[PDB]
Amino acid sequence: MKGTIVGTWIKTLRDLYGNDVVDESLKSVGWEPDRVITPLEDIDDDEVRRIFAKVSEKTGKNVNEIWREVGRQNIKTFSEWFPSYFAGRRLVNFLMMMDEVHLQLTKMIKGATPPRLIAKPVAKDAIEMEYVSKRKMYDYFLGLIEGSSKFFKEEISVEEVERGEKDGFSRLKVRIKFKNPVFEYKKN
Numbered sequence: 001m002k003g004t005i006v007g008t009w010i011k012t013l014r015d016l017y018g019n020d021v022v023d024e025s026l027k028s029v030g031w032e033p034d035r036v037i038t039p040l041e042d043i044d045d046d047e048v049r050r051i052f053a054k055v056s057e058k059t060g061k062n063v064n065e066i067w068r069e070v071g072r073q074n075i076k077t078f079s080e081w082f083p084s085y086f087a088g089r090r091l092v093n094f095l096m097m098m099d100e101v102h103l104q105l106t107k108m109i110k111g112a113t114p115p116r117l118i119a120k121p122v123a124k125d126a127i128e129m130e131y132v133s134k135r136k137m138y139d140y141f142l143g144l145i146e147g148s149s150k151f152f153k154e155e156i157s158v159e160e161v162e163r164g165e166k167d168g169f170s171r172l173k174v175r176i177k178f179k180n181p182v183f184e185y186k187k188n
């Protein structure tokens with residue numbers, strides 16, 4: 001996992017559960033207080049899982065519920081760390097650029113494995129979006145969508161069309177319907 005993104009998760013975990021829960025969890029995996037993670041660092045996914053496993057133990061919350069809450073809250077964290085990705089956009093632009101963002105924010109990393117997040121318009125008021133990743137972070141993905149709706153103040157409904165693993169890839173396809181239409185037909 002890109003170290004910067006792990007850094008956003010650490011800040012979000014403090015916002016959600018408190019500095020004590022986080023500081024202790026980080027020290028149980030051997031980090032010294034307070035590690036600063038660099039733009040080029042890579043945190044091993046097994047460490048992330050161990051950090052979140054300790055958060056689950058101390059909060060009494062199941063790790064899926066943690067990831068869902070982290071997904072919702074990390075949009076606010078992203079808006080402070082990556083402000084140009086939010087300003088001057090609406091919810092549907094933001095969602096539809098995510099697949100390219102994740103390709104190119106990891107394109108410089110050797111053996112990179114970004115989630116695919118391909119979105120496609122299917123109606124004037126709806127897109128389909130498919131999470132595809134070997135990491136099976138379904139609740140984080142869904143929380144990020146719900147937090148994106150909150151940040152942009154645009155009402156959506158999310159229909160989870162299908163969720164399952166194939167060839168080692170976890171996939172979750174959602175249909176996102178906007179209360180107010182977001183597309184018009186235009187020239188190719």
Ligand code: HEM
Nearest residue numbers: 001002005078098105113114115133135137140141144145
């Ligand atoms: C808003 C600014 C965002 C930035 C800068 C960003 C960037 C990143 C980066 C660099 C990673 C690490 C990829 C890797 O290490 O392989 C990541 C993880 C992830 N991103 Fe984002 N992302 C953003 C928003 C979103 C949104 C809106 C979604 C979903 C609609 C999303 C879905 C995910 C998921 C699910 C992961 C977990 C990794 C996995 O499942 O394989 N991200 N993000």
